Structures are given as structure tokens and as C-alpha cells.
Amino acid sequence: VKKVRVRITLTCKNLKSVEKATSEIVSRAKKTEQVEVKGPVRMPTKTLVITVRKSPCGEGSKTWDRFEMRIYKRIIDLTCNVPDVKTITNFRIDPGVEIELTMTA
């Protein structure tokens, strides 16, 4: 049994989509026999803040726009062979959702 510990990383600009991949990746991996999954772990939500003075010309009172971009990173671990992973990654995952993979023994 050539077992390979696989690291599934998922980083995304919005929560709607990243939670689907996470939810379904596990849903799908648990259902395979050659599978061992470490629960979907949620890293701390990083927030990029950009505060901007509204108006273009500096007139009128002080108006500030607080803009945010949230980035959720989820991490999943897998006990499988090399084909097993490519079997579970066969989803239909939304755009702008980066998925990185690490293979160790």
C-alpha cells in the first residue's frame, strides 16, 4: 500500500464558494475506501483593509471609505495514493478559488 499524505489548500476571495469546495471535498473523500481525511481546518481569516478619502478633490468634510477584501484559507489532509486525489478533485469548483496540493509519504 503506497500511501501518500496529501495536503489540500484552498484560498478564496469570498466565503460562499470556498465553503462549497471544502464541504464537498470531504463529503467526497469520506465516501472512498482508500481514504483517510483530517477534518477541514479553517485557518484565521486574513483581512486586507484599505481606507480611502472618498471625494477626488479634497473639498467638503472628511469622508472615508473602509474597503475590505476577505481571504479564507481552508486546509484538508488526505491519506491516499496519487490516483485517489485526482479522483476526488473532479468537482466543478467556482472561479477565483486557488487549490494547491502537497504530497508526502
Q: Which residues bind RNA (CB under 7 A)?
A: 9, 15, 19, 38-45, 47-66, 72-73, 75
Instruction: Output 3 or 96, the one with its CB closest to other proteins.
Output: 96
Instruction: Output 63 or 90, the one with its CB closest to RNA.
Output: 63
Compute the least distance from the CB of residue 87 to RNA, in Å. 21
Count of residues in contact with other proteins, rule CB under 8 A: 14
Measured on CA atoms in the order 102, 20, 33, 38, is the torsion positive or negative? positive
The residue within the footprint of other proteins, chosen from 39, 44, 60, 95 (CB under 8 A), is 95
**Which positions ≥6 away from 78 have C-beta within 8 Å?**
5, 6, 7, 8, 29, 35, 36, 37, 38, 84, 85, 88
DSSP letters for 28-48 = HHHTSTT-EEEEEEE---EEE
| Interacting residue ranges for other proteins, rule: CB under 8 A | 11, 13, 46, 48, 51, 62-64, 69, 71, 73, 95-96, 98
